[PDB]
Specification:
This is part of a larger assembly, with 8 protein chains of 8 kinds. Chain D has 450 residues and is mainly alpha-helical. Chain D contains 14 helices and 6 strands. In chain D, the strands form 3 sheets. A two-stranded antiparallel sheet of chain D has the order 1-2. In chain D, strands 3-4 form a two-stranded antiparallel ribbon. The longest helix of chain D has 32 residues, at 400-431. Chain F has helices at 27-53, 75-79, 82-96, 112-145. The chains are: A mainly alpha (59), B mainly alpha (214), C mainly alpha (50), D mainly alpha (450), E mainly alpha (37), F mainly alpha (163), G mainly alpha (34), H mainly alpha (33). It is classed as photosynthesis.
Chain lengths: 59, 214, 50, 450, 37, 163, 34, 33
C-alpha cells in the first residue's frame, strides 16, 4: 500500500504545484477559489499522515 | 508595563508608590489585600499601603540578602576568614565553605546575631507601630537625614532620590545573587573561590610543560 | 613556537608592554571623543553631528 | 509595473533584485523562498545518496557528501565506522523535502500576494534600514535562535544518543560525552592561538569534550548577546563608524560569511575529530604518514634494523628527529610531523614515536588501516580519474575532503569579492556619488595643486 | 538502496537533486517572457 | 454549555451526549470535578520529580521509617502503612472541609478578562497533568514488573540529568 | 632576542591601533560632500 | 530492457518541461507575470 499511497501523494503534489503558482499570480483568482485549495491542502496532509502511519506500522 | 513590555499590569498598580515602579507585577499580588495576613500586627489605622507593606518586605529581604552576599565572599576572599579565634580552629576561620561554617559555629554566636537582629526588628516594630503616615521602610533613625548614628546623613533630596534607587536596585539584584551563591555552594560542596580560581587558570592536565628550550 | 599560547604572549613583559601602545591610542582617541551620550542623527550613515 | 521596470526603478533587468531594497514584504518573500530552496536541496541530495548507496564500499569511496555528517551525528553507524542501516538518512531526507515544500509556498505567497511594505499593515515586522533599535532587535532575535541551535547540538551529543567519537577506547563508536570541558582558558585558547603550523587556530580541536564545551560556550554567548542587543541601542563609538543602510549590512554579512567559508574549507582538510577519517577518508598528511608507516613495517618484516638505516642523504629514511626533538617518520613526510591520528597514537610516547612499541607491539589492524589510507589519498582529477596525475585511469575516486575544501574555498573568496564590491557601493551611495561626479562640483578642482 | 517500498519511486529521486539549478534558469526564461523589461 | 473550557484544539470536545443535557445542571459539577482532578494530578507530577533529588529528613514512624529510605514511585504506596495513609488523608479531608492554610483566603482581584484567561489556562494545565500522571504510573508499574520491560530503566524517562 | 620580539610587538600594536582608531574616528563623515 | 533509462529520461523529462508549462499558463491567462 505504501508504494501506492505515495504514488498518489506524488500525483496530488504535482497537481497542486502546477496550479498554485498559476493561481496566486492571476489577479483575484485566489480568493474566489480558496476553499477548494484548503480542501486539497487537507487532503495532502492527510496523505502524508497516512504514509507515515503505513511505514511505522510496517516496521 | 515596560518591564513586562507586551503586558498589562494590575488595574491599579502605581508608578510612583515605590521607586521600583517599572510596572513589573505579572501575577501582581499587589492587587490582593496584602493586609495583616494571618494577623500581621493589624492596625486598621494608617496601616501604610498594602503595596507599601510589600515594599517594606522586599526592602528587608534585599538588604539582608545583600549583606549575605558579602558574607559569602569575604569569609573566603576578603580577610580569608579572619576568625583569629583564641582556640578551636573548627567553628572559626577553618570552615571557609559557608554551609560548613554554619555547620560548625556554636550556638553562642548564633544566639548573638539572633538577638542582634532581634533587637533590630524590635526597634523596627517600635518605630513602625507608631511610624504611620509614611512608614518609609520603617526608616526611623537608621542613617536617616537626622542620622541617628555617626556621620549623620548629609545629602540632597535629589541625591536622596538617587540613593533610594541605589538601595532598592542593589537589594533586588542581591536577592538574585544570594540564591545564586547558595545553590552554587550546596551543589558543589565548595566555596566560590574554588571554582572561580581553577576556572581562571589552565588545567594541570595540559600545560605544555615549560619552556625548557635551549 | 608551536606552543599554542594565548595570543602569543610568552613573557609577562611582552603583554605588559603591548599594553601601553593600545592604551596610548585609547587616550589620544578619548581626547577628541569624551562626554558623548546622545545626538542620534537617525539617517543613512550621516554621523554629521560631531 | 511600478517597481518592476528600469524606468520606475532605475535598475536594469540583470541587476533586478536591487529593486527590493526598499520593499519589505517582497524581500521577505524572496528570503523565505531561498531558504526553502536550501532545504529542498538538502533533502533531495540525502535521498539521492541513499538511493545510490552500496554497502560494500566505505562512504568516502562512493562520492558521498551528506551521509558523512549524519553518521558523525551518530545515526546508523556501528563500531569502526561501519554503516548498519540507512533508514534515519531517508527519514531526514523526507522531512527536509516536506519542510521545503512548506517554505517554498510561504516564500511564493509573500513575494506575489503579500503586501509590498510590511510597515503599514504590520507595524512589528516593518523596518527602515535607518533606525538602529529595530535592526538590533532582529539581530538579537536571530542570535537567540542560533544559540538555541548550538544548545540543541550539545544536548544531542550529551543526552540524545551521543555522537561518533574516533578517539573512543576500543575504536570509533557512538558514545555519550558525559564531562565536557568548561574551562574558559582551554576553550578560548583555540580562539586566541596562532593560525600557523603546529597551532591550527580552530581546526586543531582534538577530543569531543572540547567540541562540546566550545558549543556550550558559543550557545551561552549567543543567548546573552541576543538578549543584550534586543534591549540596548548602539553606542556612540559604534554610531559614527558604521554605514547604516541595507547594502552595508549585506556587505558586513558577506565579509563574515567569507571568513566562515574559508575556515570551513580549511577545517575539512585537516581535522580528524569532527571529520572522522573512516567517513571522509584520510587527510592530506594522513596519507603520507600512512605510506611511511606501511613501508616501515614492510621493511621491518624482512629483518632490517629500523631506526638505524641511514637514508640517501644520511638523514634517516624511517625515523627522524623533529626540529623540536620529537621522533617522527622520515622522508618528505617530515613536514607533517604535527599529525595525530587514532591509529598512530597507540605508538606515540611522551618522547614521540616510541621505538619499543614499533619493534614489538605492532597490530594487524593498524597495518590494514595504513594500507587502505595510502591506497586512498586525497589525490584526483576533475574527471575523477584518481591517483597521481601521471597514473592511468582504472580507479575512479576523488576524496570528499578535496571536493569540500576546493568548493568552499572558491565560494569563500568570491564572497570576499562580494564584500568588497558591496561595501564600496554602499559607502558611495550613502555619501552620494555612486552615479557620477557632478560636472559642476568636481572636488578635484577645489583642491590645492601638487 | 532505498527501502523496498520506494525502489519503484527511485527514478524521481534520480532527478530530484538537480531541480534547483533549473529554478535559476526559470528566472531567466521568465525575464525573457516579459521582454527583459 | 459552551462556557469556559474550550480553545483552539476543540470548540467543545464532547464526542458523546455527555455535554448536551443537564445544561448548567451537571456542567458546573463537572467543572468542579475536572478542576479538582487536574490540580491534584499536577501536584502528583511535582511529587514524583521532587523526591528524586531532595528529601526531607523526617522519621514518619519515630525511631525508624525515615523518608530518606522509603522508595519513590508506586512502591511508597505498598510501603506507607494503611492507617498511616488513612491519617494523611484524614488531614487532607479536614483541609477540604476547613480550608486550613493552603491559601485559606486571598485570591486578589483579577478583572474578569484576565480572570477568565487564568481559569482557562488552569483547566488546560491540569488536564495535561492528568495524562502526565498516567504515563508516569504506567512506566513505573511496567518496570516494576520486568525490571526494564519498557527499556529505559531510570524512573523519570525524560529529565535524564536527574537520574 | 626577547628584546627584538618586544620591539616588534610594540611596532605592530602601535600601527594596528593607529589603524583601528583612525577608522573609528568618524571616517564616513570624512567625504567630499560634507 | 534498461528500464532504468526509460525511467530516468522521462522523469527528467516531466520535470524539465513543468516550470515552462507554468510560464505558458501565466502568459496565456494574462497574468501579472
Ligand atoms: C501508526 C503507528 C505508528 C508507529 C508504529 C510508528 C513507528 C515509528 N515512527 Mg512514526 N508516525 C506516526 C505513527 C506511527 N509511527 C504518525 C501518525 C506520524 C505523524 C504523521 C508519525 C511520524 C513520524 C516521524 C516524523 C518519524 C517517525 C518515526 C518512527 C520510528 C521511530 C522509532 C524507531 O527508530 O524505531 C526503529 C525503526 C527503524 C529502524 C525503521 C523505521 C518508528 C518505527 C521516525 C523514523 O522513522 O525515523 C527512522 C521519524 O522520524 N514517525
Ligand atoms: C532565489 C532567487 C530569486 C528569488 C527568490 C527572486 C524573487 C523576486 N524577484 Mg527576482 N531575479 C532572480 C532571482 C530571484 N528573484 C534572478 C536570478 C534574476 C536575474 C534574471 C532576477 C531578476 C528580477 C527582476 C528583474 C525583478 C525581480 C523581482 C523579484 C520579486 C518579484 C518577482 C515577481 O513578481 O515574480 C513574477 C513572476 C512570476 C509570477 C512567474 C514565476 C512563477 C513562479 C513564482 C515560479 C516558481 C513556481 C514554483 C516552481 C512552484 C512551487 C509551488 C509550491 C507550492 C511548491 C521577488 C521578490 C521583481 C521586483 O523587483 O519586484 C518588485 C523584478 O522586477 N527579479
Ligand atoms: C547573499 C549574498 C548576496 C546577496 C543577497 C546579493 C544581492 C545583490 N547583489 Mg550581489 N554579489 C554577491 C553576493 C550577494 N549579492 C557576491 C558574492 C558577489 C561577488 C561575485 C556579488 C557581486 C555583485 C555585483 C557585481 C552586483 C551585485 C548586485 C546585487 C544586487 C542585485 C543583484 C541581482 O539582481 O541579482 C541578479 C542575478 C543574476 C543576474 C544572476 C547571474 C548569474 C551569475 C552571473 C552566474 C552564476 C553561476 C553559478 C555559480 C553556476 C552557473 C550554472 C550554469 C553553468 C548553468 C543585490 C542587492 C548588483 C548591484 O550593484 O545592485 C545594486 C551588481 O551590479 N552583486
Ligand atoms: C521568516 C519567516 C516569516 C516571516 C517573518 C513572516 C511574517 C509574516 N507573515 Mg508569514 N509565512 C511564512 C514565513 C514567515 N512569515 C511561511 C513559511 C508561510 C507558509 C506556511 C507563511 C504564511 C503566511 C500567511 C498565509 C500569512 C502570513 C502573514 C504574515 C504577516 C503577519 C503574520 C502574523 O500575523 O503573525 C503574528 C505572529 C506574532 C505576532 C507577517 C509579515 C499574513 C499576512 O501578511 O497576510 C495578511 C498571512 O495571512 N504568512
Ligand atoms: C552575529 C553576531 C553579532 C553581530 C553581527 C553583532 C553586532 C554588533 N555588536 Mg555584538 N555581540 C554578539 C554578537 C554579535 N554582535 C554576542 C554574541 C555578544 C555577547 C558577547 C555581543 C556583545 C556585544 C557588546 C558588548 C557590544 C556589541 C556591539 C555590537 C555593535 C558594534 C560591533 C563592533 O563594532 O564590533 C554591532 C551592532 C557594541 C555596541 O554597539 O553595543 C550596542 C558593544 O558594545 N556586541
Ligand atoms: C478528570 C476528569 C474529568 C472531568 C470531570 C472533566 C469534565 C469536563 N471536561 Mg474534560 N478532560 C479531562 C478530564 C475530565 N474532564 C482530561 C483528562 C482531558 C484530556 C484528554 C479532558 C479534555 C477536555 C476538553 C478538550 C474539553 C473538556 C470539557 C469538559 C467539560 C464538558 C465535558 C467538563 C467540565 C470540554 C469543556 O470544558 O467544554 C472541552 O472542550 N475536557
Ligand atoms: C475524606 C474526605 C473528603 C471528603 C468529604 C471529600 C468530599 C468531596 N470530594 Mg474529595 N478528595 C479527597 C477527600 C475528600 N473529599 C482526597 C483525599 C482527594 C485526593 C487529593 C480528593 C479528590 C477529589 C476529586 C479529584 C474530586 C473530589 C470531589 C469531591 C466532592 C464530590 C465532595 C465534596 C472531584 O471533584 N475529591
Ligand atoms: C534539556 C535537557 C534534556 C534532555 C537531554 C532530555 C532528554 C530526553 N527526554 Mg526530556 N525533558 C526535559 C529536558 C531534557 N530531556 C525537560 C526540561 C522536560 C520538561 C518539559 C522534558 C520532558 C520530556 C518528556 C515529556 C519526555 C522526554 C523524553 C526524553 C528522552 C527522549 C527525547 C530523552 C532521554 C521522552 C522519553 C518523553 O516522553 N522529556
Ligand atoms: C549610620 C548608619 O548606620 O546608616 C547606614 C546606612 C547604610 C545604608 C547601611 C550605609 C550604607 C551603605 C551600604 C551598607 C551598602 C551596601 C551594599 C551592598 C552590600 C550591596 C551588595 C550587593 C551585592 C549584589 C547586588 C550581588 C552581587 C553579585 C552577583 C549578582 C553575582 O553575580 C555573583 C556571582 O556569584 C555568582 C552568583 C556566581 C559566580 O560564579 C559568578 C558571580 C561571582 C559573578 C551606611 C553608609 O553604612 C550608613
Ligand atoms: C519568487 C520567484 C522565484 C522563486 C521561487 C521559489 C524560490 C520557489 C521555491 C519553491 C520550492 C522550494 C518548492 C518546493 C517544493 C517541494 C515539493 C513539491 C516536495 C514534494 C515532495 C514529495 C512529493 C516527496 C515524495 C516522496 C516521498 C514522500 C517518499 C520518497 C519518495 C518521494 C521523494 C517521491 C523565481 C526565482 C522562480 C522567479 C521570480 C519569482
Ligand atoms: Cl618520502
Amino acid at each position: 500500500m505504501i508504494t501506492a499511497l505515495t504514488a498518489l501523494f506524488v500525483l496530488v503534489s504535482l497537481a497542486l504545484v502546477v496550479t498554485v503558482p498559476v493561481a496566486l499570480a492571476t489577479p483575484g483568482e485566489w480568493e474566489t477559489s480558496k476553499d477548494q485549495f484548503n480542501k486539497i491542502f487537507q487532503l495532502w496532509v492527510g496523505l502524508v499522515v497516512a504514509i507515515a502511519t503505513a511505514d511505522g506500522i510496517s516496521t | 508595563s515596560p518591564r513586562a513590555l507586551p503586558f498589562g499590569s494590575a488595574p491599579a498598580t502605581l508608578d510612583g508608590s515605590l521607586v521600583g515602579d517599572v510596572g513589573f507585577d505579572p501575577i501582581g499580588f499587589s492587587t490582593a489585600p496584602f493586609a495583616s495576613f494571618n494577623n500581621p500586627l493589624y492596625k486598621e489605622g494608617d496601616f501604610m499601603s498594602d503595596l507599601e507593606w510589600l515594599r517594606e518586605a522586599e526592602l528587608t529581604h534585599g538588604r539582608i540578602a545583600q549583606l549575605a552576599v558579602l558574607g559569602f565572599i569575604w569569609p573566603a576572599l576578603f580577610g580569608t576568614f579572619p576568625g583569629n579565634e583564641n582556640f578551636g580552629g573548627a567553628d572559626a576561620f577553618s570552615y571557609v565553605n559557608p554551609l560548613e561554617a554554619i555547620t560548625h559555629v556554636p550556638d553562642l554566636a548564633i544566639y548573638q546575631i539572633v538577638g542582634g537582629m532581634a533587637w533590630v526588628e524590635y526597634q523596627r516594630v517600635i518605630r513602625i507601630k507608631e511610624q504611620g503616615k509614611n512608614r518609609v521602610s520603617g526608616d526611623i533613625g537608621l542613617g536617616y537625614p537626622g542620622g541617628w548614628n555617626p556621620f549623620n546623613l548629609n545629602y540632597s533630596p535629589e541625591e536622596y532620590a538617587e540613593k533610594q534607587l541605589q538601595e532598592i536596585k542593589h537589594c533586588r539584584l542581591a536577592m538574585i545573587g544570594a540564591f545564586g551563591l547558595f545553590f552554587q555552594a550546596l551543589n558543589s560542596g565548595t566555596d566560590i573561590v574554588s571554582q572561580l580560581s581553577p576556572a581562571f587558570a589552565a588545567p594541570d592536565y595540559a600545560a605544555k610543560a615549560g619552556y625548557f628550550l635551549p | 613556537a608551536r606552543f599554542a599560547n594565548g595570543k602569543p604572549q610568552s613573557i609577562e613583559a611582552k603583554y605588559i608592554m603591548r599594553s601601553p601602545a593600545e592604551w596610548d591610542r585609547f587616550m589620544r582617541f578619548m581626547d577628541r571623543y569624551a562626554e558623548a551620550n546622545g545626538l542620534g542623527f537617525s539617517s543613512x550613515x550621516x554621523x554629521x553631528x560631531x | 509595473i511600478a517597481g518592476r521596470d528600469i524606468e520606475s526603478t532605475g535598475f536594469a533587468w540583470w541587476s533586478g533584485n536591487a529593486r527590493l531594497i526598499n520593499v519589505s514584504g517582497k524581500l521577505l518573500g524572496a528570503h523565505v523562498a531561498h531558504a526553502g530552496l536550501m532545504v529542498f536541496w538538502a533533502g533531495a541530495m540525502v535521498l539521492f545518496e541513499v538511493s545510490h548507496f552500496v554497502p560494500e564500499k566505505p562512504t568516502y569511496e562512493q562520492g558521498f557528501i551528506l551521509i558523512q555528517h549524519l553518521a558523525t551525528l551518530g545515526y546508523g553507524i556501528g563500531p569502526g565506522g561501519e554503516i548498519t542501516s540507512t533508514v534515519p538518512y531517508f527519514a531526514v531526507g523526507v522531512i527536509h523535502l516536506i519542510s521545503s515544500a512548506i517554505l517554498g509556498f510561504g516564500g511564493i505567497y509573500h513575494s506575489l500576494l503579500g503586501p509590498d511594505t510590511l510597515e503599514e499593515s504590520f507595524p512589528f515586522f516593518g523596518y527602515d534600514w535607518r533606525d538602529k533599535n529595530k535592526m538590533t532587535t532582529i539581530l538579537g532575535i536571530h542570535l537567540c535562535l542560533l544559540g538555541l541551535g548550538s544548545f540543541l547540538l550539545v544536548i544531542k551529543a550529551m543526552y540524545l544518543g551521543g555522537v561518533y567519537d574516533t578517539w573512543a577506547p576500543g575504536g570509533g563508536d557512538v558514545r555519550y560525552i558525559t564531562t565536557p570541558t568548561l574551562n574558559p582558558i582551554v576553550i578560548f585558547g583555540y580562539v586566541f592561538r596562532s593560525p600557523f603550523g603546529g597551532d591550527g587556530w580552530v581546526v586543531s580541536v582534538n577530543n569531543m569534550e572540547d567540541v562540546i564545551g566550545g558549543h556550550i560556550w558559543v550557545g551561552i554567548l549567543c543567548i546573552v548577546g541576543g538578549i543584550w542587543h534586543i534591549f540596548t541601542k548602539p553606542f556612540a563609538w559604534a554610531r559614527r563608524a558604521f554605514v547604516w543602510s541595507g547594502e552595508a549590512y549585506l556587505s558586513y554579512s558577506l565579509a563574515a560569511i567569507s571568513l566562515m567559508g574559508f575556515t570551513a574549507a580549511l577545517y575539512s582538510w585537516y581535522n580528524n575529530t569532527a571529520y572522522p577519517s573512516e567517513l571522509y577518508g584520510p587527510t592530506g598528511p594522513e596519507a603520507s604518514q600512512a605510506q611511511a608507516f606501511t613501508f616501515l613495517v614492510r621493511d621491518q618484516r624482512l629483518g632490517a634494523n629500523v631506526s638505524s638505516a641511514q637514508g640517501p642523504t644520511g638523514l634517516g629514511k624511517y625515523l627522524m628527529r623533529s626540529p623540536s626533538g620529537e621522533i617522527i617518520f622520515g622522508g618528505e613526510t617530515m613536514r607533517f610531523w604535527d599529525l595525530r591520528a587514532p591509529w598512530v597514537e597507540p605508538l606515540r610516547g611522551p618522547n614521540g614515536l616510541d621505538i619499543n612499541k614499533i619493534k614489538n607491539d605492532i597490530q594487524p589492524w593498524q597495518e590494514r588501516r595504513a594500507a587502505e589510507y595510502m591506497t586512498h589519498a586525497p589525490l584526483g582529477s576533475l574527471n575523477s580519474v584518481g591517483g597521481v596525475a601521471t597514473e592511468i585511469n582504472s580507479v575512479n575516486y576523488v576524496s570528499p575532503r578535496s571536493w569540500l575544501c576546493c568548493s568552499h574555498f572558491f565560494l569563500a573568496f568570491f564572497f570576499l569579492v562580494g564584500h568588497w564590491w558591496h561595501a564600496g557601493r554602499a559607502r558611495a551611495a550613502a555619501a552620494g556619488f555612486e552615479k557620477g561626479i557632478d560636472r559642476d562640483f568636481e572636488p578635484v578642482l577645489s583642491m590645492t595643486p601638487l | 538502496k532505498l527501502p523496498e517500498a520506494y525502489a519503484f519511486l527511485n527514478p524521481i529521486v534520480d532527478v530530484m537533486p538537480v531541480i534547483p539549478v533549473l529554478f535559476f534558469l526559470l528566472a531567466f526564461v521568465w525575464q525573457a517572457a516579459v521582454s527583459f523589461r | 454549555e459552551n462556557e469556559i473550557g474550550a480553545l483552539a484544539p476543540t470548540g467543545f470536545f464532547d464526542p458523546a451526549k455527555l455535554s448536551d443535557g443537564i445544561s448548567q445542571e451537571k456542567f458546573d459539577q463537572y467543572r468542579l470535578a475536572e478542576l479538582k482532578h487536574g490540580r491534584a494530578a499536577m501536584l502528583a507530577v511535582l511529587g514524583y520529580v521532587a523526591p528524586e533529588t531532595y528529601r526531607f529528613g523526617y522519621d514518619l514512624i519515630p525511631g525508624e521509617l525515615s523518608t530518606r529510605d522509603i522508595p519513590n514511585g508506586v512502591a511508597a504506596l505498598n510501603a506507607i502503612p494503611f492507617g498511616g495513609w488513612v491519617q494523611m488523608i484524614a488531614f487532607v479531608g479536614t483541609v477540604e472541609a476547613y480550608g486550613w492554610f493552603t491559601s485559606p483566603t486571598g485570591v486578589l482581584d483579577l478583572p474578569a478578562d484576565i480572570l477568565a484567561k487564568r481559569q482557562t489556562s488552569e483547566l488546560q494545565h491540569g488536564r495535561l497533568a492528568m495524562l502526565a500522571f498516567l504515563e508516569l504510573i504506567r512506566h513505573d508499574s511496567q518496570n516494576l514488573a520486568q525490571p526494564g520491560f519498557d527499556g529505559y530503566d531510570n524512573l523519570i524517562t525524560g529529565l535524564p540529568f536527574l537520574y | 632576542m626577547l628584546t627584538l620580539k618586544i620591539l616588534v610587538y610594540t611596532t605592530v600594536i602601535f600601527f594596528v591601533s593607529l589603524f583601528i582608531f583612525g577608522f573609528l574616528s568618524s571616517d564616513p563623515s570624512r567625504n567630499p560632500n560634507r | 530492457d534498461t528500464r532504468l533509462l526509460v525511467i530516468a529520461a522521462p522523469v527528467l523529462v516531466a520535470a524539465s518541461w513543468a516550470l515552462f508549462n507554468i510560464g505558458r499558463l501565466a502568459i496565456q491567462q494574462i497574468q501579472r507575470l
